[model samples]
Target: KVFGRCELAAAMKRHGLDNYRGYSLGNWVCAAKFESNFNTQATNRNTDGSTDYGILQINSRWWCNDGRTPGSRNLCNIPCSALLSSDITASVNCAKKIVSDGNGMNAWVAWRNRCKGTDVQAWIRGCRL
Candidate 1:
C-alpha cells in the first residue's frame, strides 16, 4: 500500500513478476493488506522468544543464520540473493504463480477468511498456492 515505485518494481522484478503495473499492484496491495497491513517493518515473536523478522516477517532460522540474518531492516533493503533464498515471492512468482495454479480469487478469498482476525502469517500460509 505504501512503497516507492522503484522499490516495489525491484521486488516484483526479483520475483519474476511482469504484471507489477496495475492489476498486479492491486493484488499486491490486497495481499499486503492482509499480510502485514502494508507495514514493511512489521514483526512478531513466538512465546519461545524466537522472532519473526521484517516486512514479510521471515523466520530467521528458516531463512538465514539466526544472528546473521539479512533483510532484518526492510524488504527493499534486503540483498536479492538473500531475498530469493527465503521470501516466497523471491523463490516463486507468488502472485502470478498462485493465480496460474487455478485458484484465482478464491485463493485470496480463502486467505482473507483464514486471516479474518488473525495475524499475517496465517493468511500467508492459507494463500500459499
Candidate 2:
C-alpha cells in the first residue's frame, strides 16, 4: 500500500488533486479509503468479469487496458498496470479526465455507494491540504 489516509491526503495535495474540477480532496481521500484502502496494487474482479484496477479501482471496461477484458474503452489510454504502482500519475490523470467528462465521482460505483453524502472530512483529517 502506498499510503495511509494522512499521507495520501498530502500526496493528493501535492499532486494538485483538489484543484481538479473543484471536487474536494476529502472526496478523493474517501474514495481511496473505500476503493482500495490505499493499496495501489489492488484489483477486484467483478462477477460480470470486468476488473477494477489500482488505487482508484478504475474499471477495465471503461478506463484502462487490462487486456483480459474485451470492450474496454480505455478512455484513460493507460495500461491498468500503470495504475498499480505507488506512483499515482496514471491513476490521478485518469481520474481527472473522468471527472472532467462530467461523470464526476459517479464514474466509480465505490464512490457513489460509499463516499457520496458521507462525512468524508475524516479521510483528510490531520493532513495539511
Candidate 3:
C-alpha cells in the first residue's frame, strides 16, 4: 500500500487534485479508499469481464490496457502496470480525464456504491489538509 489518509492527502494535493475538474478532493479520497484502500497496486475483475487497475481501480475496458484483456479503448494510452507504480502520476492523469468526461467519480463503481452521499470529509479528518 502506498498511503494512509494523511499520506494520500498529501500526494493528491501534490498532484493538484484539490477539487480537480468539478469533484471534491474528499470524494476522490473516499473513492480511492474504498476502491483500493490507498494501495496503488490494487486490481480487481468485474463480472463484465473488465478488470480494474491501480489506486483508482480504472477499468481496462476504457482507460487502460492490461494486455491480458483485448478490445480496450486505452484512452489513457498507458499500460495497466503504469497505474500500479508508487509514483502515481499516470493514474492521477487518467483520473483527471475520467472526471473531465462528465462521469466524475461515478465512473468508479465503488464511488457510486460507497462514497456517494456519505461523509466524505471523514476520509481527511485530521491531517489538516
Candidate 4:
C-alpha cells in the first residue's frame, strides 16, 4: 500500500512511533519518505546480498528473516515479508526493535542522511497528531 504523508504519519503514530527511542514522528515520516516513500511493498536489494523491506526498509541481514540473507540473525523474529503487509503492526514492531539498538535511528542510513538534524517536523506538517 502506498501512503500519503499524513496517512503514513497517522499509521506510525498509532503504532507508537511518536518520540519512540528519542526519534519524533517526523523523523520516522522523513525516513520513510526517503526509504520507501511510504510504500508497504518496497524492497531494495543490498550490495551485501541482503534486502531491505517495507516502509522503514528493515534489513533482512539483522532484523527479519527472508530465507535469502545469508546468516541472517532475524533479531526481530519475524519474516521479512511481514514488513510488506499493509497492517503495519509487524513493521512497526520490528522498527522499534531496530531503533532500540545502540545505534538508535542511525540504524537507517536514510534517517541519518536525510532526517538527522533536519527540520523533520515538515514531514508531518498539517497532520493533526
**Global lDDT scores for all candidate models:** 0.42, 0.84, 0.86, 0.93
Ranked by TM-score, the better of candidates 1 and 2 is: 2
Query: lDDT tens string, model 4, 11-126?
Result: 89999999998889999999999999989999999999999999999999899999988887899999999999988899899888889988999999999998899999999999
Which runs in model 4 stand beyond 4 Å of their true positions?
A: none
Residue 78 in model 3: lDDT: 95
Top-TM-score candidate index: 4
Q: Model 3 over residues 18-75: C-alpha lDDT tens digits?
A: 8887667788889899899999999999877879988999898998988877766899
lDDT (tens digit, per residue) of candidate 1 on 1-129: 344434444464456543432234334434545544545555565455445543344444343334544344332333323422324453234345445545453444433564334443332233213
The clash number for model 4 is 0
Error of 2 at 114 (Å): 1.7
The best candidate by lDDT is 4
Ranking by lDDT: 4, 3, 2, 1
Per candidate, the number of residue pairs that clash is 0, 0, 0, 0
| Residue runs of model 3 more than 4 Å from their true location after superposition | none
Which 10-residue window in model 1 sums to the lowest lDDT?
120-129
Clashing pairs in 2: none
> In model 2, which runs have C-alpha deviations exceeding 4 angstroms?
none
TM-score sort, best first = 4, 3, 2, 1
Residue-level lDDT of model 2, residues 15-106, one tens digit each, is: 87885777789899889888999999999998878898888888888888888887668999988899898788888888888888877789
How does each model score on TM-score?
Answer: 0.36, 0.92, 0.93, 0.97
